[PDB]
Amino acid sequence: MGGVSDERLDLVNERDEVVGQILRTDPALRWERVRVVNAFLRNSQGQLWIPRRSPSKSLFPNALDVSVGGAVQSGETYEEAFRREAREELNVEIDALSWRPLASFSPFQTTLSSFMCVYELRSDATPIFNPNDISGGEWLTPEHLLARIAAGEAAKGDLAELVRRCYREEE
């Protein structure tokens, strides 16, 4: 009774016995330790796209926010999820340019809304209607990026050093 839709989460036993049908819009679930797909979009060896604007509405600081962040359909294959996202943004299909899991944001050092992964995709495409996770940051440079996190964006200390040594240095 129905069909596809704006992303849906179907819970099935193992074969094809859907135990429960949870919707992304449905608040029935408790969003906190859910699964999410996050990634940083960079290209041209210098074009780093990431949110810079400060949240005047909300009342909670943060280190940094990824570029492309969405939800995982059903929940089982992170590749399929991220793929659909990268395909809808620029039909990249995460199999034309080059992508690699930079890390995983969730534990605490990152502090996000839920358990999301971090993948580095080589490209320069704008996001879509998503003002919940990240409406879409801006395209800054390497000097401005490091200069921002160092200035005062709650992305300093071990956090900044970790990225500075990971990006610049190879250790």
CATH number of the domain within which 54 lies: 3.90.79.10
Residue 75: closest CA among 135, 2, 15, 7: 7
From the annotation, which residues make up the binding site?
A: 85, 89
Please state, in angstroms and rounded to a whole number, the distance separating the CA atoms of residues 25 and 29: 9
The three-state secondary structure class of 85 is helix
Please state, in angstroms and rounded to a whole number, the distance separating the CA atoms of residues 9 and 5: 10
Residue ranges making up the domain that contains 19: 1-171
Residue with tokens 């034309």: 96
Query: Residue 64: how many CB atoms within 10 A of its CB?
Result: 20
Domain count, the chain: 1
Cα dihedral sign, 69-71-76-81 = negative
From the annotation, which residues make up the binding site for Mg(2+)?
A: 85, 89
Asked how this structure was determined, the answer is NMR
Q: Are 66 and 92 contacting, i.e. CB atoms less than 8 angstroms apart?
A: no
Please state, in angstroms and rounded to a whole number, the distance separating the CA atoms of residues 134 and 116: 13
